[model samples]
Target: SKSWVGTWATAPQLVEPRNMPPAPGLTNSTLRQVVCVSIGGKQLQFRFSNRFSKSPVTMKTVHIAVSKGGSEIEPSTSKELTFNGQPDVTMEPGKAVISDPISFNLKPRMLVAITISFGETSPDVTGHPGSRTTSYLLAGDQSSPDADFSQAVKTDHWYVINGIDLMAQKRAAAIAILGNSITDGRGSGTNKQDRWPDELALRLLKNKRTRDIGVLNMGIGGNCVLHGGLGPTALSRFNRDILKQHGVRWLIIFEGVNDIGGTPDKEAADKVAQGLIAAYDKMIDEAHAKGIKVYGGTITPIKKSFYYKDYRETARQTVNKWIRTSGHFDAVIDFDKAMRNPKDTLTLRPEAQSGDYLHPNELGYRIMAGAIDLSLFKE
Candidate 1:
């Protein structure tokens, strides 16, 4: 089972962004910015997988480059990532390849680009929303302009994404961020990597303490806490996203708005609240059994959201109340208190709202990131 494990995976993806037919929707497309985990507190080896693809994943040639922010990362900035000495390899359905052991020191918030080219058509999958942090292509080498990798790979799927990597250093640990669109950074611009997790990592590095912790963003826009809505539910994906990952020491959950606002029945809202609490209990209990810490993040204010009106605001309030008082978590991140308009407490501060009044703009992201007390990770 450990052989099957990696620092990251795409089993319960948040969203899939790419250029393909039958678009992968607002969620469920690609995995990007992967980091590696330590093997028993020592050096780490990397294994990559796209095994769940519906068909063979053929591409022109896949080139992965590291970057700072969104620029081409220099060799000093980029480390060569090899897979069995082959930079490009075709992985048939239900197969994966592992990289030879190497020493690549990983730092939190470091950005890497895994660019794929579809060489030919093999099977059909969906892709769209071109400006994704992650991109996947059909099988075949598309790097050559003449090859037309997109058409070369024979398949229906577009923008194939499985998992990204970060090779861990000594005493390494990783954490997964679970949430909806805001977490996914849908409204956030492409190449901005300004996702809260990005900002969170930046914050961790600036401080003298807690600089080694790695945070993975598993947020997807339009995602719901319960089934339906988008992609998979928070509860359903927990085992794969949180439990099975490498070197996981904590989980930060900021979800449930979709569950609250999307439910048609008032009774369902109450049930959703209880379900969230139960989910927390189950998650915390499960993580504690593994000696991991589980942290709860209060859902931020989204009163102005088109899908949600004042009544749903009450649902958010109910959830926040529980997140603050339940003591169900080892710690709580008060995102609501951090972003809510002090004047109304029901709305987000004007500056923080991404014009949508629901999501945070870049400035707000900085605020939310700064709001996180890095002390939480301190020993």
Candidate 2:
């Protein structure tokens, strides 16, 4: 059978007040979201997440169409999504389901809109709060191919829907970016698709040697490797976020800052750092079991961050040093060296600082993408 690879995906995160509060509920609303396809293919499948919901969620109808900008879609290219020959599906709590394969002509970097109509209200929603991209929420069943969401209420979070898969050439492979807010495009422009992962996808497609590769950004803001905050802890979600991804050949882990920052004291911070390293070891072991290469991204500098302290910085440094020198990972991406200030290694480079000192600005994100060695993707 030919391989099916992820062309676009977002790590599912619990809605939190720190980023954006959850909506009261989704009742008889049509949600439309725009996503970038990282690879071209002829058949597509969509995956929805209800991993954090305590009650079952029902979808009356789901549709996919080519984006014509904002909430508009190209009517000619619109298609209905289904599962097991049925247009509707019910999702149990803490579960995810993928739509049946549908024939579609998808092109690399093509923008597509996914619209969903909910039959009933869901009190709690599981979604990615760091989506950065604008999505539309309109009252009622706006599920038609020609439905105009011009007046729809706009939001930045992605609800329920999390992944898109495409049947591709057997040799096609993908890389998953697993990290926190920095990897989530916190500093990128809204709806611009200018995140580091987005830039990396463009670069991968432009390079002949890496053109067959796909990129999936599975970042969640305020996430930790050891414990949950904005989303399930990195370790807890690894199976779903990384291992379960279709055609994943490589994984880039850039987390742990939150774990370090959350530690109450220097002594505790040191222990947390060790615990993070242990988690990394386990992840590498598991990925290796699946014949997937694991790449470590040194946690970037955050000296001026809201949670920054000498002890937390100490933990960050310790983790980074191990990442660079441990030889435990298949490779290392020096995100620290790429985003840290040369004059002061504890803080972000002036050009990269997003003003918050924790996240990288657009330029910074581009620089981070540029720093990656494309050769690493070569087989």
Candidate 3:
């Protein structure tokens, strides 16, 4: 129902060895993670996932509070979360649990802190490595309203959390953004929360009609549409990242650049483009079956990128063409046209380009967010 909408979300991936929890680890420790939510609610619920875990993941104690910057939480707003009326929650492999919705007050675009004290955890952790926000870890059980972080180990990653859902108005709904680094906030500042989706959330909150539409970022850095990316392919994670989200009435697919850039040869690149279209076709149908409206966002410019030689700009162009001309999608968002350089159609606008070329900077992200038609989300 539109009444229960995801206010904040991240695409969960298998936590690689390098991205595993540093000092104190997840075992016998406490975790404090911060997430900036979109829409407000009088009541809210927390979602945790063990989708990529091979062992049982337990949270002996869980706490939720309004974040006051850094790793601190507003003591007055702190509250303990219960799973089925119990303080402890154990999620089996490939499972997720939603806590009992608590009567909590929250405002739009507010940052919330989630703290968990672990008993038995798993190395097969499900996390979003591109958190772009700080998470704290401290030894021993310390799930408190305002826990001390003086000796906490900070890391820029999020674990277990699937999303935060809110009890919003009838028109409230969510748009799941599926893509790679561009949508994952690759070029944005760490802890700044200025990703294109975040910018879009800000705009939605500013507008009266679309203000209740939440944004769920399902992007993974270096992810691909079909195969071969840092995390799971967009196709593989579509069900979890999009359909499973709360009140997700809309989807925007802006992936396939990595698939194009990662190909080895010209012919392979062309095949990659074909594979992208095929993947998009399937994703659209799957989403449509669930009565969700899907929009196609054309791939942005990638000229002079590190993988430019292998990027096969023509393949990128081909995918863009299909995303634009094909009536398969409910609507189209032309990111390709919005990000291209005026002087060189194949390259990203100079000011918008992040130093590496594949992703956009904060200014570029703002521009991308500005290009969206907010009316599309209105009822």
Candidate 4:
């Protein structure tokens, strides 16, 4: 009944020029990135990615420990991670590898710090800039557990590291969520796990029947469903983000808003929905073939956005209508219906609106999480 399950995973993308690592980058220095795991387990492994790098990146040393908040870790829990029983690993350009399994019992919803000393990383590194959490950087291979980061450089991005997995059982499972900035925690506080998916994971943790299900937030800011956006298009990276993830039993597609918002006119907007719908059906077919149930998430309200054009709203409505009535998805999560204003129907509820009016604030994320029926996850 034993299996490996992903407790925390982020979609990998090429680090943009602006979000690239600061000076003294990954060259004989250490980076400490903190992540919140969805479920608890006794044994674990890590997936380090260099999938977008133009050159090889060698990890000189890697360690994991229980975080103590703000670039600190409990010294007693510190443990070095290895690849193929070696203390170091060299990842070739466009490749990723998993660390050897280690014994480390983790608790649900707890933060774990992944500290890595580099062996010359590249400028074209792969990372997820949507990391709302702060990562710490210090000079030298600081595996001393109590390495002082009082003078370290802080950045709100994740590099090289991709996922943290746990050894689970047959009954445990993972859910992979694909979307844009909304699901990537754009309005969520720094270091505060208040994203809608995070809240959903918390809810799963509380329900005994669904407690073993892991929430894999594979969202990227500005990601599109059909073509170019911030990261690779949803259709292009489906295998890497969802299908290849550990123990995934379900999939959720909450994307297409950015794609729809990019449309120019009523004719173009109306026609664009076909692309999104086709992509959704393709993903559903692929997931079902692997025995994974796919859920459709309606594009949230976008009537009063800064980028709001009348036609974008047309595209949004078109996509949402299909998600609600197609019956192609195993189930539906009507985020638009739940968070839209009752009075306006087109705009977000006042309480759900973030500064931008497109993405939701922390309170809105809570509402989105509550809208999900826990029964859908019952095994």
TM-scores of the candidates in the order shown: 0.77, 0.96, 0.97, 0.98
Candidate 2 lDDT tens digits, 1-379: 7878998999886566544422424677788989888988899999998888888888999988889788889899988898899999999888888999999889899999988898774566788888888988877787888777898888888888889898877679999989988888889988888899998999999999898899999998878889756788999999999999999999999889888878889999999989999999999999999989999999998888897998998888889989999999999999899998989988899887779899899999999999999988865
lDDT of 3 by residue, 196-307 (tens): 9999999999999888889999999889888888888898898888988889999999998888888888999999999999999999999999999999999998788887
What are the Cα lDDT values of the candidates?
0.59, 0.87, 0.89, 0.90
What are the runs in model 4 whose C-alpha is more than 4 Å off? none
lDDT of 4 by residue, 1-379 (tens): 7989999999999988999878778778899999999999999999999998999998999999999888988889999998988989999999998999999869999899999998788889899999999998888888778788767899999998999898888999999999999999998888998899999999999988999999999999999989878989899999999999999999999999888878778887777788999999999999999999999999988777876888788778778888899899999999998898999988899887677889999999999999999898866
Ten-residue segment with the worst summed lDDT in candidate 2?
A: 16-25
For model 2, the local distance difference test gives 0.87
Task: Give the Cα error of residue 216 in candidate 4, in Å.
Answer: 0.5
Stretches off by above 4 angstroms in model 1 are 1-52, 59-61, 68-98, 102-109, 117-159, 162-170
The model with the greater TM-score, 1 or 3, is 3
The model with the greater lDDT, 1 or 2, is: 2
lDDT of 1 by residue, 1-379 (tens): 1222234333333224333343322122222232222122223344444444455554334444444333233344333445567655566765555555545443344444444444333343322122335333332223332222222222222134444444445445667778887777655656566767778877766665655666666675667777776766777767766776666777888888888877776677778777777877888898889878888999888766775665666677788888899898889999998988999887889987778888888878878888887878753
Show the colliding residue pairs in model 2. Answer: none
The candidate scoring highest on lDDT is 4
